[PDB]
Amino acid sequence: ANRFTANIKGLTQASRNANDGISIAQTTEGALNEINNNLQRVRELAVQS
Amino acid sequence: VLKDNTAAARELLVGDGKETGITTKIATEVKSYLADDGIIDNAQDNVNATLK
């Protein structure tokens, strides 16, 4: 029972760790969305040029 | 002006009709704007890509 309890708590913590990873990945993705939109505007300007 | 200097004013508005005439130039640049792959269509394509 001691061993099982330790594993249970560890896995529980790992759950929120994975959630944190999700959060950071999403934020990075949003930033990259902004970068991509700006680069699309650059493409517009190049097509003009 | 029409009564008196009609030919003169014609030379201004139209002129040769090839590289002269206010209407001539206006037609040239409006055609450039409206031409395929023109500025308008380029902007619209950009917007469509953003929608995608």
Side-chain angles (χ1 to χ4, degrees):
Chain A
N2 258 276
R3 292 170 196 173
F4 289 154
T5 304
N7 285 10
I8 291 154
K9 289 180 180 178
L11 300 155
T12 314
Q13 170 69 333
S15 183
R16 284 181 280 91
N17 273 334
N19 280 275
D20 252 7
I22 289 172
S23 321
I24 197 164
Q26 279 187 346
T27 306
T28 50
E29 150 56 7
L32 271 73
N33 281 342
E34 289 274 35
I35 276 185
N36 172 262
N37 303 346
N38 277 9
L39 287 166
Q40 284 198 54
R41 178 57 175 190
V42 184
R43 203 169 208 285
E44 274 188 328
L45 300 167
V47 185
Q48 168 34 264
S49 78
Chain B
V1 175
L2 277 177
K3 174 197 161 184
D4 302 336
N5 316 298
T6 326
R10 179 217 74 241
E11 189 60 16
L12 183 77
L13 276 172
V14 184
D16 63 355
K18 313 157 195 165
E19 300 77 64
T20 73
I22 277 176
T23 61
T24 321
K25 291 205 172 176
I26 291 160
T28 303
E29 322 97 341
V30 67
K31 187 153 188 167
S32 186
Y33 295 134
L34 297 164
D36 263 348
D37 83 78
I39 46 186
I40 286 296
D41 222 343
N42 305 337
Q44 291 171 322
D45 303 359
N46 164 37
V47 193
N48 308 132
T50 311
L51 292 168
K52 284 191 189 174

